[PDB]
Amino acid sequence: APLGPFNATLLEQLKNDYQKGEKEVTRYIELQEKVAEKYIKMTPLSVTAKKKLPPSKDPRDYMTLSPYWWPDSTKIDGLPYIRKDGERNPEVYEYPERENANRFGDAAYCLGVLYYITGKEVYAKACANHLRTWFTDPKLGMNPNMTYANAVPGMKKMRGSGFIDSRRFSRALGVAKLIEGSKSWTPSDKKKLDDWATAFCYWMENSTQGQRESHAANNHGLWYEAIHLMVLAYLDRTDRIREVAEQSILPKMGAQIADDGSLPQELKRTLSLHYSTFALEALMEANQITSQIGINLWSTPASNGKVASQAVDYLYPFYLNPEDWKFKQIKPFDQSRAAILLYEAGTALGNQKYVDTAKRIGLKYSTSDVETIPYLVLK
Amino acid sequence: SAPLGPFNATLLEQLKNDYQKGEKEVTRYIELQEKVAEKYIKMTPLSVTAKKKLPPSKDPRDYMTLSPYWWPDSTKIDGLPYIRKDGERNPEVYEYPERENANRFGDAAYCLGVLYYITGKEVYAKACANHLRTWFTDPKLGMNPNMTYANAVPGMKKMRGSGFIDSRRFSRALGVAKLIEGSKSWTPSDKKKLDDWATAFCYWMENSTQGQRESHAANNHGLWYEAIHLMVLAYLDRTDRIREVAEQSILPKMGAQIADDGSLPQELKRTLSLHYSTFALEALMEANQITSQIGINLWSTPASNGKVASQAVDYLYPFYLNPEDWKFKQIKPFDQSRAAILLYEAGTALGNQKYVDTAKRIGLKYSTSDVETIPYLVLK
């Protein structure tokens, strides 16, 4: 498979078996094709579909509200907003790109994977329609920056809470590699998307906000690099992937994992089990890319000898029984997330107990959750 | 004496009296409330018709929302029928503009109507009236007097939803309209139109199949059903019906829902058991604000089976002091601030000084813009 943001092993297996005509896979892919129909007819979304404009007055600038920031009832204007860790302010849904980036990302990802597996042009044609409108269209495409993501009303500073929201559309950017070679994705379409990705990577690496996120001391630093690797892998920058892994990701794991395997920066949050899992999910998506060039992030030590497998080790009992979690978790933790996580970590580490537990937890065979498309092995 | 309405009449009357007398603490508090109210004077009146996705009637004047705990089923190709996840609010609810817009309307009308009553300034009645006409009676922008499509559940093929309970947001605004009667802005024609809306809504609440069914609910929905019923009846000055509803529906429902230890078993079976136990009593508290203005005390009057609402406050009081001791499922944090008004309302009604003290100890922020707290300077 081309370099991209997916388990390449599971994708190649699926395509081989689908092409061999194996019945188990062929039936599963035919179900995936019925799931994918809604995306062929889905009208492409655009970041410009908003009324309240960002400070730039540019509808092509992505803008969202940092989710845990709320109006202060004790101020006449509600300003400045105050933080309530773990309590999502429903005002986030007043920024249409928040949910529309998810819907775009799901549609592009599903269609691109189904094109890779089946070879059917109809999936590339529709995948391409979503990509052009979201990224490159000169009036509907988003500007390649995240300047106004997670803004905090009343804040007298830049940024606000990061740009971790980028993972939604950067996974879609990566799957565009899968439709290269189709008749619907022209050489001109690719150049424009290449040029967008180069400008977004530049912003990510050189803007003050991009620099700050690259140095974040918690799961935001790891998700920054997962996103960074998706953009670099899209641009075929395999040497930069090695450099980012060795000079940024691994040191971050070495600083963020304690000697007992816990993630103390996530243990202080009101959703401590969710955010510990979120940190490892960043490493999981980063690993999907690095392992395609020979770097295993679950087992490769940092300079201090710490390995990401120690953090999985620490959490595994709590994936079996979340009720035993002894740190603040003000909302229920979804055990289903441990399925893909323990399978990804288990296969990377040769831990068959992890793989067993992933399959016992499992995923629903008929689920339309697009991230689970490669994981028939769990279904 | 304050007009019959959905508020603590005793606290409202004191605030108006002290304000008109010129007492300093009240006059400064009302001046703060006046600063808070300025956003409502300039606020563009909202309407239920401001939506794209129309209900099955295809009438934008029909109020429609999604039942909050119903989610697409990802194992179905269309996500239908939706499945229930108790206590987990589906963010799809925010795609139905009237859910939050009824809140914004209700807060704006309640604040402005109360400020007219206290201060007498025509500017508050004028703006309060603008919000009322647009939301309720306008022949193009006003909502139809029904809740047929409130809390719909996609894929459900049976008339159901329990919609109703969303009504409390605008039914409180309907009741405070009585406070601007006599202003220059609220004309006899404005009143007649609103009386006619309220009569039609009352007819729907009592005679529709959905209204009948909600009137029979055995949990907090039946109590909220009657609280909203009382707001509409009090707006229409139908005091004999208020007594009838209190004596024949609310108190029997309250008595059937209270167990021997004072717990509310229907709310204990929920994933947000402390929230819903408190929510049931908030229904009784707002109903009592109306019944007590005609001489019926719902906190102290026992039901036919001997159960009395004070028993339910008694059971919950220890958990209002220390919510962490709650031993039933509460999958989200409980807001202890809710106990301030509840324990003050129940405490004053019952002559329980321990409740009133705790109410003031939890307290409310002096400067909060939360409109439901306007009558409660005693707590700030």
B362 within 8 A of B354, measured Cβ to Cβ: no
Residue B95 contacts residue B114 (beta carbons within 8 Å): no
Per-residue CA distances from A161 to A146, A151, A171 (Å): 11, 7, 20
Q: Which CATH architecture has domain B229-380?
A: Alpha/alpha barrel (1.50)
| A275's tokens | 């955010």
CATH class of A216-379: mainly alpha
Give burial (CB, 10 Å; 0-12/13-18/19+) of B46: buried
**What are the residues whose beta carbons fall under 8 Å from the beta carbon of A326, sequence distance 6 or more?**
none
Q: Are A248 and A214 in contact (CB under 8 A)?
A: yes
Of B35, B100, B367, Cβ closest to residue A74: B367
Side chain identity at residue A51, one-letter code? K
Pairwise CB contact (< 8 Å): B367 & A331: no
Strand A69-70 to strand A82-83: parallel, antiparallel, or no bridges (unpaired)?
A: antiparallel
* A188 class by beta-carbon count within 10 Å (0-12 exposed, 13-18 middle, 19+ buried): exposed
Nearest residue of chain A to residue B37 (CA atoms):
A76
Residue with tokens 């906000």: A209
The strand pair at A148-151 and B64-66 is best described as unpaired
Is B345 within 8 Å of B376 (Cβ atoms)?
no
Question: Do B43 and B134 form a contact (C-beta atoms < 8 A)?
Answer: no
Which residue from A74, A99, A368 is facing B365, i.e. has the nearest CB?
Answer: A74
CB pair distance less than 8 Å for A366 and B100: no
Short-list A4, A1, A66, A57, CA closest to A235: A4
Instruction: Report CA Rg, chain B.
Output: 20
Q: Are strands B70-71 and B83-84 parallel, antiparallel or unpaired?
A: antiparallel
Residues of chain A with a CB closer than 8 angstroms to some CB in chain B: 34-35, 73-76, 78, 87, 90, 93-94, 99, 330-332, 364-369
**Rounded Cα distance, A276 and A337, in Å:** 12
* Rounded-to-integer distance, Cα B217 and Cα A33, Å: 44
Q: How far is B7 from chain A (nearest CA, A)?
A: 21
| Half-sphere exposure (Cβ direction) of B310: Cα atoms closer than 13 Å | 15
Closest Cα partner for B154 from B70, B96, B60? Answer: B70
Q: Roughly what angle, to the nearest 10 degrees, separates helices B168-176 and B98-119?
A: 20
How far lies B36's CA from each of A194, B20, B44, in Å? Answer: 51, 20, 16
**What is the rounded distance in angstroms from the CA atom of residue A134 to the CA atom of residue A45?**
6
Q: B322 CB contacts (<8 Å, ≥6 apart)?
A: none
Taking the C-alpha atoms of residue A298 and residue A310, their distance in angstroms, rounded to an integer, is 9
State the sign of the Cα–Cα–Cα–Cα dihedral A274, A275, A276, A282. positive
| Residue A153, preceding peptide bond in cis (omega within 30° of 0) | no
Please name every residue paired with B71 in a beta bridge, in sequence order, or none if there are none.
B83
CB B40 within 8 A of CB B127: yes
In order of A234, A324, A332, the CA distances from B330 in angstroms are 44, 16, 10
CB contacts, 8 Å: B332 with chain A: 330-331
> Which chain A positions have a beta carbon within 8 Å of B370's beta carbon?
73
Residue numbers in B near A74 (CB within 8 A): 365, 367-369
The torsion angles phi and psi of B364, rounded to 5 degrees, stand at -125, 155
Q: Which two tokens stand for residue A301?
A: 């030590």
Q: How far is B129 from chain A (nearest CA, A)?
A: 23
Paired tokens of A109:
């990802």
C-alpha of A327 from chain center: 25
Minimum distance, in Å, between the CA of residue A98 and any CA atom of chain B: 12
How many angstroms separate the CA atoms of A118 and A238, rounded?
27
Domains A1-214 and A216-379 share a fold: yes
Residue type, B154: P
Name B336's Cβ contacts closer than 8 Å, sequence gap at least 6. B320, B323, B362
List residues bridging with B152 in a β-sheet.
B66
Closest CA in chain B for residue A367: B75
d(CA A112, CA B35): 55
Assigned architecture for domain B1-216: Alpha/alpha barrel (1.50)
Distance CA A251, CA A216 (A): 12
Of A76, A93, A369, the CB nearest to B36: A76
State phi, psi for A297 to the nearest 5 degrees: -80, -15
List, as own/partner pairs, every contact residues A95-100 make where C-beta atoms lie below 8 angstroms and the sequence separation is at least 24, other chains included: A95/A50, A95/A52, A95/A63, A95/A64, A95/A65, A96/A49, A96/A50, A97/A47, A97/A49, A97/A50, A97/A62, A97/A63, A97/A64, A97/A142, A98/A64, A98/A65, A98/A165, A99/B91, A100/A45, A100/A46, A100/A47, A100/A49
Round to whole Å and give the CA distance between B129 and B122. 10
Q: Looking at the complex, report in whole angstroms how far the Cα of residue A270 sits from the nearest Cα belonging to chain B.
A: 11
- Determine how many CB atoms are found less than 10 A away from the CB of residue B51: 17
The domain spans of chain A are 1-214, 216-379
The strand pair at B64-66 and A69-70 is best described as unpaired
CA pair distance B101, B86, nearest whole angstrom:
24
SS3 sequence of chain A: CCCCCCCHHHHHHHHHHHHHCCHHHHHHHHHHHHHHHHHHHCCCCCCCCCCCCCCCCCCCCCEEECCCEECCCCCCCCCCCEECCCCCCHHHHHCCHHHHHHHHHHHHHHHHHHHHHHCCHHHHHHHHHHHHHHHHCCCCCCCCCCCEEEECCCCCCCCCCCCHHHHHHHHHHHHHHHHCCCCCCCHHHHHHHHHHHHHHHHHHHHCHHHHHHHCCCCHHHHHHHHHHHHHHHHCCCHHHHHHHHHHHHHHHHHHHCCCCCCCHHHHCCCEHHHHHHHHHHHHHHHHHHHHHHCCCCCCCCCCCCCCCHHHHHHHHHHHHCHHHCCCCECCCCCCCHHHHHHHHHHHHHCCHHHHHHHHHHCCCCCCCCHHHCCCHHHC
State how far residue B96 is from chain A, nearest Cα, in angstroms: 12
Q: Residues before each break in chain A (C–N > 2.5 Å)?
A: none
Contact residues, chain B, for A94 at CB < 8 Å: 94
Please give the Cα distance from A118 to A107 (Å, whole number). 16
Chain A residues with beta carbon closer than 8 angstroms to that of B333: 87, 330
Q: Which chain B residues contact residue A64 at CB under 8 A?
A: none
Distance CA A202, CA B122 (A): 59
SS (H, E, C) chain B: CCCCCCCCHHHHHHHHHHHHHCCHHHHHHHHHHHHHHHHHHHCCCCCCCCCCCCCCCCCCCCCEEECCCEECCCCCCCCCCCEECCCCCCHHHHHCCHHHHHHHHHHHHHHHHHHHHHHCCHHHHHHHHHHHHHHHHCCCCCCCCCCCEEEECCCCCCCCCCHHHHHHHHHHHHHHHHHHCCCCCCCHHHHHHHHHHHHHHHHHHHHCHHHHHHHCCCCHHHHHHHHHHHHHHHHCCCHHHHHHHHHHHHHHHHHHHCCCCCCCHHHHCCCEHHHHHHHHHHHHHHHHHHHHHHCCCCCCCCCCCCCCCHHHHHHHHHHHHCHHHCCCCECCCCCCCHHHHHHHHHHHHHCCHHHHHHHHHHCCCCCCCCHHHCCCHHHC
Q: Give the total residue count for chain A.
A: 379
> Rounded to a whole number, what is the distance in angstroms from the first to the last CA of chain A?
22
List, in sequence order, every residue forming a beta bridge with B138; answer none if it has no partner: none
From CA A128, how far away is CA A111, in angstroms rounded? 9
Query: Are A74 and B368 inside 8 Å of each other by CB?
Result: yes
Q: What angle do CA B75, B79, B83 make, to 5 degrees?
A: 85
- Residue B368: its chain A contacts at CB < 8 A? 73-74
Cβ(A132)–Cβ(A182) below 8 Å: no
How buried is B177 (Cβ within 10 angstroms: 0-12 exposed, 13-18 middle, 19+ buried)? buried
**Terminal-residue alpha carbon distance, chain B:** 24
Measure A88 CA to nearest chain B CA, in Å: 11
Put simply, the answer to whether A87 touches B333 (Cβ < 8 Å) is yes
Q: B192 to chain A, minimum CA–CA distance in Å?
A: 36
B207, with CB counted inside 10 A (0-12, 13-18, 19+), is: exposed
Residue B38, burial from CB neighbour count under 10 angstroms (0-12, 13-18, 19+): exposed
Question: Do B77 and A367 make contact, defined as CB atoms within 8 angstroms?
Answer: no
CA A221/CA B357 separation, integer angstroms: 48
Superfamily of domain A1-214: Chondroitin AC/alginate lyase (1.50.10.100)
Neighbours of B306 (CB within 10 A): 9
Inter-chain CB proximity B91 and A99 less than 8 Å: yes
Structure tokens at A119: 């070879």
Residue B98 has which token pair? 């009237």
Residue among A34, A75, A365 whose CB faces B77 most closely: A34
d(CA A106, CA B77): 15
